[PDB]
Structure formats: C-alpha cells, structure tokens
Short mmCIF file of C-alpha atoms in Angstrom, two decimals:
data_model
loop_
_atom_site.label_atom_id
_atom_site.label_comp_id
_atom_site.label_asym_id
_atom_site.label_seq_id
_atom_site.Cartn_x
_atom_site.Cartn_y
_atom_site.Cartn_z
CA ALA A 1 -6.98 -18.88 -11.01
CA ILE A 2 -3.56 -17.63 -9.76
CA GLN A 3 -2.32 -21.22 -10.29
CA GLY A 4 -4.19 -21.20 -13.64
CA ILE A 5 -2.17 -18.13 -14.79
CA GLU A 6 0.96 -19.93 -13.50
CA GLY A 7 -0.01 -22.84 -15.82
CA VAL A 8 -0.59 -20.41 -18.74
CA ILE A 9 2.92 -18.90 -18.30
CA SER A 10 4.29 -22.48 -18.01
CA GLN A 11 2.67 -23.43 -21.37
CA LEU A 12 4.10 -20.20 -22.88
CA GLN A 13 7.58 -21.32 -21.68
CA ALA A 14 6.81 -24.74 -23.23
CA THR A 15 6.03 -23.04 -26.60
CA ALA A 16 9.29 -21.06 -26.30
CA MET A 17 11.32 -24.28 -25.73
CA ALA A 18 9.51 -26.12 -28.58
CA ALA A 19 10.39 -23.28 -31.01
CA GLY B 1 -17.24 -18.97 -44.18
CA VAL B 2 -14.79 -17.93 -41.40
CA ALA B 3 -16.48 -18.70 -38.05
CA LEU B 4 -15.18 -16.08 -35.60
CA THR B 5 -12.76 -17.51 -32.98
CA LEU B 6 -14.15 -18.33 -29.49
CA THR B 7 -11.36 -18.01 -26.86
CA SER B 8 -13.47 -19.10 -23.84
CA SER B 9 -17.06 -20.06 -22.81
CA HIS B 10 -18.57 -16.54 -22.48
CA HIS B 11 -17.26 -15.52 -25.94
CA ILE B 12 -20.24 -15.44 -28.36
CA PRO B 13 -19.83 -17.51 -31.60
CA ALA B 14 -20.08 -15.83 -35.05
CA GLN B 15 -23.72 -15.07 -36.08
CA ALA B 16 -24.65 -15.99 -39.69
CA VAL B 17 -26.89 -13.77 -41.91
CA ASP C 1 -1.80 -21.26 26.40
CA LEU C 2 -1.79 -19.32 23.13
CA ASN C 3 -3.39 -16.35 24.90
CA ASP C 4 -0.39 -16.04 27.23
CA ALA C 5 1.97 -16.07 24.24
CA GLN C 6 -0.07 -13.30 22.59
CA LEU C 7 -0.02 -11.29 25.83
CA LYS C 8 3.76 -11.65 26.15
CA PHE C 9 4.09 -10.56 22.52
CA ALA C 10 2.05 -7.44 23.30
CA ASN C 11 4.12 -6.75 26.42
CA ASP C 12 7.40 -6.98 24.49
CA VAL C 13 6.11 -4.67 21.74
CA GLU C 14 4.91 -2.13 24.31
CA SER C 15 8.19 -2.29 26.24
CA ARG C 16 10.26 -1.73 23.10
CA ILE C 17 8.14 1.25 22.04
CA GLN C 18 8.55 2.63 25.57
CA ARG C 19 12.32 2.19 25.43
CA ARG C 20 12.53 3.83 22.00
CA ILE C 21 10.63 6.86 23.30
CA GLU C 22 12.78 7.04 26.44
CA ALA C 23 15.99 6.83 24.39
CA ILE C 24 15.34 10.10 22.55
CA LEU C 25 13.58 11.80 25.46
CA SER C 26 16.54 11.16 27.79
CA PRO C 27 19.35 13.35 26.30
CA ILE C 28 17.35 16.60 26.36
CA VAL C 29 14.94 16.17 29.37
CA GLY C 30 17.45 14.13 31.40
CA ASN C 31 17.63 10.66 32.99
CA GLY C 32 14.52 10.01 35.16
CA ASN C 33 12.95 13.32 34.13
CA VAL C 34 10.81 11.41 31.68
CA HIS C 35 8.44 8.44 32.09
CA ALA C 36 6.37 6.83 29.33
CA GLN C 37 4.08 3.80 29.10
CA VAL C 38 2.66 2.19 25.95
CA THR C 39 -0.45 0.08 25.37
CA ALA C 40 -0.99 -1.74 22.06
CA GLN C 41 -4.18 -3.06 20.48
CA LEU C 42 -2.94 -5.97 18.37
CA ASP C 43 -4.30 -8.18 15.59
CA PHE C 44 -4.37 -11.92 16.33
CA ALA C 45 -7.06 -12.79 13.76
CA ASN C 46 -6.00 -14.97 10.82
CA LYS C 47 -7.23 -13.38 7.58
CA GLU C 48 -6.89 -14.67 4.02
CA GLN C 49 -7.90 -12.61 1.01
CA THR C 50 -7.99 -13.14 -2.76
CA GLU C 51 -8.52 -10.09 -4.99
CA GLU C 52 -9.50 -10.12 -8.67
CA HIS C 53 -9.40 -6.96 -10.81
CA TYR C 54 -10.56 -6.51 -14.40
CA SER C 55 -9.44 -3.54 -16.47
CA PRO C 56 -12.45 -1.80 -18.07
CA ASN C 57 -12.81 -2.24 -21.83
CA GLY C 58 -15.87 -0.09 -22.58
CA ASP C 59 -13.80 2.36 -24.64
CA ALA C 60 -12.98 1.14 -28.15
CA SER C 61 -9.45 2.56 -27.88
CA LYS C 62 -8.32 0.30 -25.02
CA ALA C 63 -10.48 -2.70 -25.99
CA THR C 64 -8.60 -5.86 -26.96
CA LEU C 65 -10.34 -8.09 -29.49
CA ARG C 66 -9.98 -11.68 -30.68
CA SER C 67 -12.83 -12.00 -33.19
CA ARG C 68 -15.26 -9.47 -34.62
CA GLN C 69 -18.16 -9.93 -37.04
CA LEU C 70 -19.74 -6.77 -38.48
CA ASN C 71 -22.63 -7.31 -40.90
CA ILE C 72 -23.84 -4.02 -42.40
CA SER C 73 -26.80 -3.65 -44.76
CA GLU C 74 -28.35 -0.49 -46.25
CA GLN C 75 -31.22 -0.96 -48.72
CA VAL C 76 -32.14 2.57 -49.78
CA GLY C 77 -35.32 2.75 -51.85
CA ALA C 78 -36.03 9.29 -45.84
CA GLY C 79 -38.15 7.09 -48.09
CA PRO C 80 -38.17 3.31 -47.71
CA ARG C 81 -34.72 3.13 -46.12
CA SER C 82 -33.63 -0.04 -44.34
CA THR C 83 -30.48 -0.05 -42.22
CA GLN C 84 -29.31 -3.18 -40.41
CA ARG C 85 -26.09 -3.62 -38.40
CA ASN C 86 -25.31 -6.93 -36.66
CA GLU C 87 -22.12 -6.63 -34.58
CA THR C 88 -20.55 -9.44 -32.54
CA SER C 89 -17.32 -8.86 -30.61
CA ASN C 90 -15.23 -11.18 -28.43
CA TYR C 91 -12.83 -9.43 -26.06
CA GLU C 92 -9.74 -10.34 -24.04
CA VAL C 93 -9.40 -8.48 -20.75
CA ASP C 94 -6.55 -7.70 -18.38
CA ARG C 95 -6.65 -9.75 -15.20
CA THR C 96 -4.84 -9.39 -11.87
CA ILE C 97 -5.21 -11.96 -9.08
CA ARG C 98 -3.71 -11.00 -5.72
CA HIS C 99 -3.56 -13.48 -2.85
CA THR C 100 -2.77 -11.99 0.56
CA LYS C 101 -2.26 -13.63 3.95
CA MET C 102 -2.15 -10.94 6.63
CA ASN C 103 0.43 -11.34 9.38
CA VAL C 104 -0.76 -12.41 12.83
CA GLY C 105 0.30 -9.97 15.52
CA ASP C 106 0.08 -6.65 13.65
CA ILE C 107 -0.68 -3.40 15.47
CA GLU C 108 -4.18 -1.94 15.11
CA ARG C 109 -4.17 1.12 17.38
CA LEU C 110 -1.38 2.48 19.58
CA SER C 111 -1.95 4.97 22.40
CA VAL C 112 0.96 6.29 24.43
CA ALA C 113 1.05 8.26 27.69
CA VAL C 114 4.20 10.30 28.43
CA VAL C 115 4.87 12.43 31.51
CA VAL C 116 7.83 14.80 31.89
CA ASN C 117 9.29 16.50 34.97
CA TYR C 118 9.80 20.17 35.77
CA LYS C 119 13.16 21.98 35.62
CA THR C 120 14.86 22.60 38.98
CA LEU C 121 17.60 25.20 38.54
CA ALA C 122 20.66 25.64 40.74
CA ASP C 123 18.44 27.45 43.25
CA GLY C 124 16.02 24.51 43.21
CA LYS C 125 12.83 26.16 41.94
CA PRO C 126 10.81 23.71 39.79
CA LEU C 127 10.46 25.89 36.69
CA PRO C 128 7.98 24.41 34.18
CA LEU C 129 8.95 23.86 30.55
CA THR C 130 7.95 26.06 27.60
CA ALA C 131 5.48 25.59 24.76
CA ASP C 132 8.21 25.12 22.14
CA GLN C 133 9.91 22.42 24.20
CA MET C 134 6.57 20.69 24.75
CA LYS C 135 5.91 20.73 21.00
CA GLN C 136 9.37 19.28 20.39
CA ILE C 137 8.69 16.48 22.89
CA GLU C 138 5.34 15.77 21.22
CA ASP C 139 6.96 15.57 17.78
CA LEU C 140 9.76 13.32 19.05
CA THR C 141 7.27 10.99 20.74
CA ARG C 142 5.15 10.88 17.59
CA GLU C 143 8.23 9.92 15.58
CA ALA C 144 9.32 7.26 18.08
CA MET C 145 5.88 5.67 18.46
CA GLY C 146 5.35 5.51 14.70
CA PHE C 147 2.31 7.77 14.96
CA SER C 148 -0.23 7.29 12.18
CA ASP C 149 -3.75 8.55 11.55
CA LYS C 150 -5.06 5.52 9.65
CA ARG C 151 -4.47 3.35 12.73
CA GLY C 152 -6.11 5.91 15.01
CA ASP C 153 -3.13 6.54 17.27
CA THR C 154 -3.53 8.91 20.22
CA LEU C 155 -0.68 10.62 22.08
CA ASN C 156 -0.82 12.66 25.30
CA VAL C 157 2.24 14.36 26.82
CA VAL C 158 1.72 16.45 29.96
CA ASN C 159 4.18 18.38 32.13
CA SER C 160 4.07 18.06 35.92
CA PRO C 161 6.60 18.03 38.79
CA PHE C 162 7.61 14.55 39.92
CA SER C 163 6.96 13.48 43.49
CA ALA C 164 9.75 12.67 45.94
CA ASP D 1 7.78 -18.04 18.03
CA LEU D 2 7.67 -16.51 14.55
CA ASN D 3 6.55 -13.19 16.06
CA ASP D 4 9.77 -12.95 18.07
CA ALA D 5 11.82 -13.59 14.92
CA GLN D 6 9.91 -10.82 13.12
CA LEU D 7 10.47 -8.46 16.05
CA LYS D 8 14.21 -9.19 16.11
CA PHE D 9 14.29 -8.58 12.35
CA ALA D 10 12.65 -5.18 12.90
CA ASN D 11 15.08 -4.37 15.72
CA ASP D 12 18.11 -5.18 13.56
CA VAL D 13 16.80 -3.08 10.67
CA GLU D 14 16.11 -0.13 12.99
CA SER D 15 19.53 -0.43 14.64
CA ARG D 16 21.33 -0.48 11.29
CA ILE D 17 19.42 2.58 10.05
CA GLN D 18 20.31 4.31 13.33
CA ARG D 19 23.99 3.44 12.92
CA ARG D 20 24.03 4.64 9.31
CA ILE D 21 22.57 7.99 10.38
CA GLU D 22 25.02 8.30 13.28
CA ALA D 23 27.97 7.49 11.01
CA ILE D 24 27.48 10.58 8.83
CA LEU D 25 26.18 12.79 11.64
CA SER D 26 29.28 12.11 13.78
CA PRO D 27 32.14 13.79 11.80
CA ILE D 28 30.48 17.22 11.60
CA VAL D 29 28.34 17.41 14.84
CA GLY D 30 30.83 15.36 16.89
CA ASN D 31 30.81 12.10 18.88
CA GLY D 32 27.87 12.06 21.38
CA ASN D 33 26.54 15.37 20.07
CA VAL D 34 24.00 13.44 18.07
CA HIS D 35 21.40 10.82 19.05
CA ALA D 36 18.93 9.13 16.70
CA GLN D 37 16.34 6.36 17.04
CA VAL D 38 14.47 4.56 14.25
CA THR D 39 11.13 2.75 14.20
CA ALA D 40 10.09 0.63 11.21
CA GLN D 41 6.65 -0.51 10.08
CA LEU D 42 7.39 -3.76 8.26
CA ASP D 43 5.55 -6.12 5.90
CA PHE D 44 5.18 -9.72 7.11
CA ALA D 45 2.19 -10.58 4.91
CA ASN D 46 2.73 -13.19 2.19
CA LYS D 47 1.36 -11.86 -1.12
CA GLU D 48 1.23 -13.59 -4.50
CA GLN D 49 0.14 -11.80 -7.65
CA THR D 50 -0.37 -12.75 -11.31
CA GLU D 51 -0.81 -9.94 -13.84
CA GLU D 52 -2.13 -10.29 -17.40
CA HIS D 53 -1.93 -7.44 -19.91
CA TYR D 54 -3.38 -7.28 -23.43
CA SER D 55 -2.18 -4.71 -25.94
CA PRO D 56 -5.14 -2.86 -27.49
CA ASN D 57 -5.90 -3.69 -31.13
CA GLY D 58 -8.79 -1.32 -31.87
CA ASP D 59 -6.70 0.64 -34.40
CA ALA D 60 -6.36 -1.07 -37.78
CA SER D 61 -2.69 -0.02 -37.99
CA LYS D 62 -1.51 -2.05 -34.97
CA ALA D 63 -4.05 -4.88 -35.37
CA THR D 64 -2.59 -8.32 -36.09
CA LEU D 65 -4.78 -10.63 -38.16
CA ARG D 66 -4.89 -14.35 -38.92
CA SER D 67 -7.99 -14.64 -41.12
CA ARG D 68 -10.28 -12.05 -42.65
CA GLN D 69 -13.44 -12.47 -44.74
CA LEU D 70 -14.83 -9.34 -46.43
CA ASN D 71 -17.98 -9.84 -48.51
CA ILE D 72 -18.99 -6.63 -50.31
CA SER D 73 -22.12 -6.22 -52.43
CA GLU D 74 -23.48 -3.11 -54.18
CA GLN D 75 -26.61 -3.55 -56.32
CA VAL D 76 -27.27 -0.08 -57.74
CA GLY D 77 -30.61 0.20 -59.54
CA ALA D 78 -30.08 7.44 -54.36
CA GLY D 79 -32.62 5.24 -56.13
CA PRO D 80 -32.97 1.56 -55.28
CA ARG D 81 -29.42 1.19 -53.97
CA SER D 82 -28.48 -1.86 -51.91
CA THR D 83 -25.16 -1.96 -50.07
CA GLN D 84 -24.13 -4.97 -47.98
CA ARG D 85 -20.79 -5.53 -46.22
CA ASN D 86 -20.18 -8.67 -44.14
CA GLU D 87 -16.80 -8.49 -42.39
CA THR D 88 -15.32 -11.20 -40.15
CA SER D 89 -11.88 -10.76 -38.59
CA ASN D 90 -9.82 -13.02 -36.31
CA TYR D 91 -7.04 -11.28 -34.39
CA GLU D 92 -3.88 -12.28 -32.54
CA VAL D 93 -3.04 -10.10 -29.55
CA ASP D 94 0.08 -9.36 -27.55
CA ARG D 95 0.09 -11.01 -24.13
CA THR D 96 2.25 -10.46 -21.04
CA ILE D 97 1.89 -12.63 -17.93
CA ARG D 98 3.80 -11.45 -14.86
CA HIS D 99 3.98 -13.59 -11.72
CA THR D 100 5.23 -11.80 -8.61
CA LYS D 101 5.91 -13.08 -5.09
CA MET D 102 6.54 -10.12 -2.78
CA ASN D 103 9.32 -10.48 -0.24
CA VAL D 104 8.37 -11.00 3.41
CA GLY D 105 9.92 -8.39 5.67
CA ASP D 106 9.85 -5.32 3.43
CA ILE D 107 9.60 -1.81 4.88
CA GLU D 108 6.23 -0.03 4.63
CA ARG D 109 6.76 3.26 6.49
CA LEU D 110 9.88 4.55 8.26
CA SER D 111 9.83 7.40 10.78
CA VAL D 112 13.04 8.62 12.38
CA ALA D 113 13.64 10.93 15.34
CA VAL D 114 17.03 12.69 15.55
CA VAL D 115 18.20 15.08 18.26
CA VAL D 116 21.40 17.14 18.10
CA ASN D 117 23.31 19.01 20.81
CA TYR D 118 24.26 22.67 21.09
CA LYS D 119 27.75 24.07 20.44
CA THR D 120 29.83 24.89 23.53
CA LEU D 121 32.75 27.10 22.54
CA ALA D 122 36.04 27.46 24.40
CA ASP D 123 34.26 29.78 26.84
CA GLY D 124 31.57 27.14 27.37
CA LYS D 125 28.45 28.97 26.18
CA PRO D 126 26.00 26.52 24.53
CA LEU D 127 25.57 28.35 21.23
CA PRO D 128 22.73 26.88 19.13
CA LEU D 129 23.28 25.80 15.54
CA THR D 130 22.23 27.73 12.42
CA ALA D 131 19.45 27.21 9.88
CA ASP D 132 21.86 26.14 7.12
CA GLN D 133 23.48 23.53 9.36
CA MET D 134 20.05 22.25 10.41
CA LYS D 135 19.03 21.93 6.75
CA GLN D 136 22.26 20.04 6.03
CA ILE D 137 21.55 17.65 8.92
CA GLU D 138 18.00 17.13 7.64
CA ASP D 139 19.26 16.35 4.12
CA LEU D 140 21.93 13.96 5.43
CA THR D 141 19.40 12.14 7.61
CA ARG D 142 16.98 11.89 4.68
CA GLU D 143 19.75 10.37 2.56
CA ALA D 144 20.81 7.92 5.28
CA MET D 145 17.28 6.77 6.13
CA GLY D 146 16.37 6.23 2.48
CA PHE D 147 13.61 8.83 2.71
CA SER D 148 10.78 8.31 0.24
CA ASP D 149 7.35 9.87 -0.24
CA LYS D 150 5.57 6.79 -1.64
CA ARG D 151 6.24 4.95 1.63
CA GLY D 152 5.09 7.92 3.70
CA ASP D 153 8.33 8.48 5.61
CA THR D 154 8.44 11.21 8.26
CA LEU D 155 11.61 12.80 9.65
CA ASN D 156 11.99 15.20 12.58
CA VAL D 157 15.33 16.72 13.61
CA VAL D 158 15.33 19.21 16.50
CA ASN D 159 18.17 21.10 18.19
CA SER D 160 18.39 21.23 21.99
CA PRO D 161 21.18 21.26 24.61
CA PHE D 162 21.93 17.85 26.08
CA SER D 163 21.54 17.29 29.80
CA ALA D 164 24.46 16.47 32.09
CA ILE E 1 3.18 12.82 39.60
CA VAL E 2 0.59 11.79 42.29
CA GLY E 3 3.13 9.77 44.31
CA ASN E 4 3.55 6.16 45.49
CA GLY E 5 0.36 4.94 47.26
CA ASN E 6 -1.47 8.17 46.48
CA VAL E 7 -3.18 6.39 43.63
CA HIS E 8 -5.23 3.17 43.45
CA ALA E 9 -6.87 1.72 40.34
CA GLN E 10 -8.79 -1.46 39.53
CA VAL E 11 -9.75 -2.79 36.10
CA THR E 12 -12.55 -5.11 34.97
CA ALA E 13 -12.61 -6.55 31.44
CA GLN E 14 -15.49 -7.96 29.41
CA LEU E 15 -13.77 -10.44 27.11
CA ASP E 16 -14.64 -12.41 23.97
CA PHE E 17 -14.36 -16.20 24.26
CA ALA E 18 -16.71 -17.00 21.36
CA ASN E 19 -15.18 -18.68 18.30
CA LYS E 20 -16.30 -16.82 15.16
CA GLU E 21 -15.52 -17.62 11.53
CA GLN E 22 -16.50 -15.30 8.69
CA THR E 23 -16.22 -15.36 4.89
CA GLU E 24 -16.89 -12.11 3.00
CA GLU E 25 -17.54 -11.78 -0.74
CA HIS E 26 -17.61 -8.38 -2.47
CA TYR E 27 -18.51 -7.60 -6.08
CA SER E 28 -17.55 -4.29 -7.67
CA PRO E 29 -20.59 -2.68 -9.34
CA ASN E 30 -20.58 -2.67 -13.15
CA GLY E 31 -23.79 -0.75 -13.92
CA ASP E 32 -21.83 2.13 -15.48
CA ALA E 33 -20.60 1.45 -19.01
CA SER E 34 -17.27 3.17 -18.24
CA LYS E 35 -16.15 0.69 -15.57
CA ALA E 36 -17.88 -2.37 -17.08
CA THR E 37 -15.59 -5.17 -18.23
CA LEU E 38 -16.86 -7.23 -21.16
CA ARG E 39 -16.00 -10.58 -22.72
CA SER E 40 -18.58 -10.87 -25.51
CA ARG E 41 -21.14 -8.43 -26.87
CA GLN E 42 -23.77 -8.87 -29.60
CA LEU E 43 -25.56 -5.72 -30.80
CA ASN E 44 -28.16 -6.23 -33.53
CA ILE E 45 -29.59 -2.91 -34.75
CA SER E 46 -32.36 -2.54 -37.32
CA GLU E 47 -34.12 0.61 -38.58
CA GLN E 48 -36.70 0.17 -41.36
CA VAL E 49 -37.91 3.70 -42.08
CA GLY E 50 -40.91 3.82 -44.41
#
C-alpha cells in the first residue's frame, strides 16, 4: 500500500534512531 | 542446514534434497 | 444548483480565453476590427486513480535476490549420464504506487471562432488582408488559446468585411 | 468556489510571466512597442507517490551476504564420476524508499504570444526589424518565460506595425 | 459579418441526467518473459541420459 510504504520508511527511521 | 530466507508470502521456502 | 455553478465556471473560462485572444489581436488588426468567441468542453467528473508499477526482473543482471538455493548433481557413468539442477530463487522487486485525484473543472476540448475585418485605406476601399497576415493571426490565436492536439482543439479564423 | 481560486492563481501566474517578458523587452524595443500575453496550463491534481528501488545483486562482486552454506562432494571412481554441489545463500540488499507529494498548482505547458511594433524613424517610415533582432527577442522571451522542452512550451513572436 | 437581425439561430440539447458510477481495473500483461515481474521461482531440471 502507499500507506504501507509510508510505514516501512517510518520503521526505517525508527531503526536509524535506535542505532 | 540454512533454510533460505522468506521475505513475504509468495517467496518459496528452501527445498531440501 | 451545482449545474449553474459549473456553467458560470465555463462562462468565465471562455470569457478569459476570449479576452486573451483579443488582447494580442488588437494592436495589429485594430480595436473592433477583431471579434472572437470561445466555447469550452469541461470536465466535471470526479475521478480517482491508483497506479502500481513493477520493474521487470527477468534478466539476471537487474534481478535483486534475497535467498537462492542451487542444488547441482552430475553422476557421469553420452553414456549413463545423470544431470539434476534444482534452483529456487526469492526476489525483491521495485515498486511504485501513484495515487492521483484529477481536478474537477479541467478543459477537455476547446474550439474557438475568430473573425477579422477588412482594411479600409484613406480612400475607404475595404482591402482584404494577405495570406502571411492571416497565418500570423492563426499562430497568435493558437498561442493565446493554448492550442493542443491531444485535447482535440479546433481553430477557425476567417476574413470578412464587418457590417455597418 | 475552489475553481475560482484556481483560476485567479492561473491569472496571477500569467500576468507575472507577461510582466517579466515586458520588463526585458521594453528597454530595447521601447515602451508600448511590445505587447505579450501568456496562457498557462496548470496542475491542480493531488498526486501521492511512493517509490521503492532495489540495487541488483546478481554479480558476486557486489552481492552482500549474511549466511552461506556450500556443500561440495566429488566421488571419483570420465568414469563413474559423481559431482554434487548444494549451495544456499541469504543476501542483504540495498533499499531506497522515496515518498513524494507533488505540489498543487504546478505548470504543465506554457504557450506565449508576443507581438512587436515596427521602427518609425525621424522621417516616420515604419521600417521593419531585422532577423538578428528578431532572434534576440525570441531568445529573451524564451529566457523570461522559462522555456522548456519537457513541458512542451511553444513561443511565437511576430513583427507587425501597430494600429493607431 | 451578416449584420444585426440578418441572422437567427435556435439550439436544442439532448442532455444527460442519469447518475453513473464506474470502477475500472486494468492488469498489464505479463506473458512475455522480458516484462514479467517475479517474486519466487522454482526450476527443477533433470536429464537422465542412458
């Protein structure tokens, strides 16, 4: 989904912050 | 030994032999 | 109700296209020596579209892989040869989702009718215009109206002496 | 309602492009010796797009791996040879997600009509301009209008004596 | 051109007052291996020549 890809990029940002 | 990685549902799992 | 608003929208668009044509056609042909009218076929249908595109991965050079199992067996005894290749591949593909909401009130097809006057010299003889000047008027009107071929726009400019 | 706001937006954009053209065309051709009008085909459609790109990993040199199992067997008795290679590879791939929300009100196709006057010397004879000057005017108008070929912009500049 | 009063015209219009709603679905063909997008592929090949 478009919103699904939005969620994927959001989880990538989450990984960035966690690191 | 190393079962190939399945990213989604369509991806086919590793076949043993 | 809404139909009247749409009709007024069409009238304003047509009037502004008419004024834009008249603005450039005035300095060379002269005030009142040019008349133009515009009709517009508009788009008042609400459309929503979602597009999904997958990049092809049939070529091994552009294919992105996550897991690959390649079992190869060759029991040579061509004789009693025995070849066996079991290949399993999981791919990751490029994906592009486009969501589009078309604007309500867009122009579908514009047709414009322009009429020019003759040229009355100091004597008063209504001398008609020339082919080059007519071509220039056609080009200017095409530029002003936003002429396009995908829309299906039609333009007609004719030369005739105006009545009293 | 919203259609009128969009139309006023288009009118302001067209007027500002017209003024920008007139500003540079004034010092050389002269005040009033140049008239230009602009029409703009705009984009009032809300679009949202998400793009996913995977870097290819088919070449072993750029392939990133997490786990790899390579079972190799060669029972030589070509004779009664027996080769067997079971290879399992798990890869990690580069990933790029781009989320784009296109602006509402962008320009799709701009067509501009410009008309210049003749040159009346001290005697008063309306001497037409030259080819080099016409080319200079065309280049200046292309620069002012932001002429581009991807959009599909069309420009037409013609020379003709202005009416009284 | 013709003059005031030297022209008369009347228009009749057949209009559309029927509410229509339409949903369209289109699939790009993938029968050619060059434009076919794949997620998983298993190809077992065996040749026992005697």
